[PDB]
Design a protein around this ligand. Structure first.
Ligand SMILES: Nc1ncnc2c1ncn2[C@@H]1O[C@H](COP(=O)(O)OP(=O)(O)O)[C@@H](OP(=O)(O)O)[C@H]1O
Ligand SMILES: CCCCCCCCCCCCCCCC(=O)O
Ligand SMILES: CCCCCCCCCCCCCCCC(=O)O
Ligand SMILES: [Zn+2]
Ligand SMILES: [Zn+2]
Ligand SMILES: [Zn+2]
Ligand SMILES: [Zn+2]
Lengths: 292, 294
């Protein structure tokens, strides 16, 4: 009965965890490193430069992370749903041959160019809708996600057609945020181990700062290089495991329009919006251009 | 009692400046950087201007906050007349023996100045012996150590505690306006010659340049004045009425040289010179003198 409230809240635990580490990083870098360590070394010039640059990376990081969490994933349009008359005919009939004849008649009035592995119309029994191309159902979101990529647990949302460019920018600014921390703490991370700087609480944070920042850089870098290929091939993570089957058979590059035009499907034609977590993706998520 | 009314009405100049600063943050970030400069496909200048603006905006609001809420330092309790001395003072009726009571206490205090009439500087309201460079302010209703002036735009007194913050407040006020005027200028040209014709952005970009320029021209005169005062080790009051020492009036009685005079306000550590953090030397109740006194 009340299991929904516990399940809904426990999904925010990875978000609150990442939020704490990021808040801890803002404290450790600004207070412990810049004020207690670099400012305690009479380096007013270096102190100010690091503080300004850090806030730029920190803002672009928190901005991208926020947009990746709270951008609700787009759902299929109302045209894809089975009408109350057509839904009855589907649940009333018992022959899977006539079941396909009902779905095919409605689907041919829809911009659908893909089928299932069994040459059947892609249909979702729970949502009672015909899945658009590249759209899949997520048992965590309990809904169909347009151009679904994967359900990332570290954010309480699904990475889909609406989230994708934000998720990419979140990864991008995550390495830049971590690389900038590691590259700047490094020259002082040398100090605390070899006993050049001996502050009590600053040692605990600066050491943890370098460890955590470097660990996240190596971990996320693997994921970032992974998606850079996916964007150029116009393949979601789901399609990278099962290639979509078109009318002419399975094709791993059925949605590819060339490397240049594929990046424009995610980031758009406006170059000024490429680095900003602002929605600039082309199309609507319910239909996609085909290679043929 | 109108002391309660003065306390509330005293925040009007503070709330006014707060509006102009908040309005400036909106006009520059939203109207100028997002609607105007970013609408010109100049992503490089937009990011640079936004980052630089936030640097000036932070240092400006920090100095203004410290100038407002830094309570002015008052004379120590040793300067106050003791309850024994208060009665003998109130008992006596001859102003000649009254000075002999104040002169007896002042010689146990680091006092090297008198009034223009060579009498002990004494405050009837506070019932204390005024330290050097300390004056009474009827708006603060208290004696202010090294009092400079009562600025209404901060609703506070500029004294021994506030001075370096007040100076930094003036400093970062000019830079904030200079950065606004120098960057809005290239776009202030456009709206008049009808290159950019947005309705809302025109009101804000034009007002941004006017208000920023009109504040720069006013504060620069005030800022240049105090830069001379700091080099002369003179408060605004002392620059109008020279303090009277044991050897007579001296306009440079507190001067210790240009280099050591700035160090009295900003300190010896250069890292604290530009930051609104208290780095002034001394305690405000006694100051080094040009002569053998201190
Ligand atoms: N009631 C007051 N409230 C605020 N400022 C005052 C008040 N009375 C005098 N002042 C100012 O503070 C200075 C007062 O000098 P006084 O000796 O008369 O009394 P003081 O102990 O307050 O200094 C004056 O500066 P001036 O040399 O330019 O005239 C005056 O401007
Ligand atoms: C010291 C603070 C460092 C903060 C570093 C940023 C945290 C990066 C978190 C990466 C989350 C990646 C989400 C992918 C989810 C998934 O596995 O599907
Ligand atoms: C758009 C530009 C906004 C800038 C606003 C800056 C406001 C500066 C205020 C200066 C106050 C100076 C204090 C004077 C005190 C006095 O002697 O009366
Ligand atoms: Zn579904
Ligand atoms: Zn999901
Ligand atoms: Zn006052
Ligand atoms: Zn007084």
């Amino acid at each position: 009965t009340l299991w929904r409230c516990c399940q809904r809240v426990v999904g925010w635990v990875p978000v609150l965890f990442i939020t704490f580490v990021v808040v801890w990083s803002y404290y450790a870098y600004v207070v412990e490193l810049c004020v207690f360590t670099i400012f305690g070394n009479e380096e007013n010039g270096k102190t100010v430069v690091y503080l300004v640059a850090f806030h730029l990376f920190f803002v672009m990081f928190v901005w991208s992370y926020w947009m990746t969490i709270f951008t609700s994933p787009a759902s299929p349009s109302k045209e894809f749903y089975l009408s109350n008359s057509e839904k009855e005919r589907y649940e009333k009939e018992f022959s899977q041959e006539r079941q396909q004849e009902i779905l095919r008649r409605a689907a041919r009035a829809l911009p659908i160019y893909t089928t299932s592995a069994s040459k059947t119309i892609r249909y979702c029994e729970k949502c009672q809708l015909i899945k658009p191309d590249r759209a899949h159902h997520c048992s965590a979101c309990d809904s169909c996600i347009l151009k679904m990529d994967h359900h990332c647990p570290w954010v309480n949302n699904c990475v889909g057609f609406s989230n994708y460019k934000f998720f990419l920018l979140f990864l991008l600014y995550s390495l830049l945020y971590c690389l900038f921390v590691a590259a700047t703490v490094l020259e002082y991370f040398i100090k605390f181990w070899t006993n050049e700087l001996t502050d009590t609480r600053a040692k605990f944070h600066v050491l943890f700062l370098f460890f955590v920042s470097a660990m996240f850089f190596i971990s996320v870098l693997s994921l970032f290089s992974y998606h850079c290929w996916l964007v150029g091939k116009n393949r979601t993570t789901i399609e990278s495991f099962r290639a979509p089957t078109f009318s002419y058979g399975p094709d791993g590059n059925g949605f590819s329009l060339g490397a240049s035009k594929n990046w424009r499907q995610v980031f758009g034609d406006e170059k000024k919006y490429w680095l900003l977590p602002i929605f600039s993706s082309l199309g609507d998520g319910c239909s996609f251009p085909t290679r043929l």
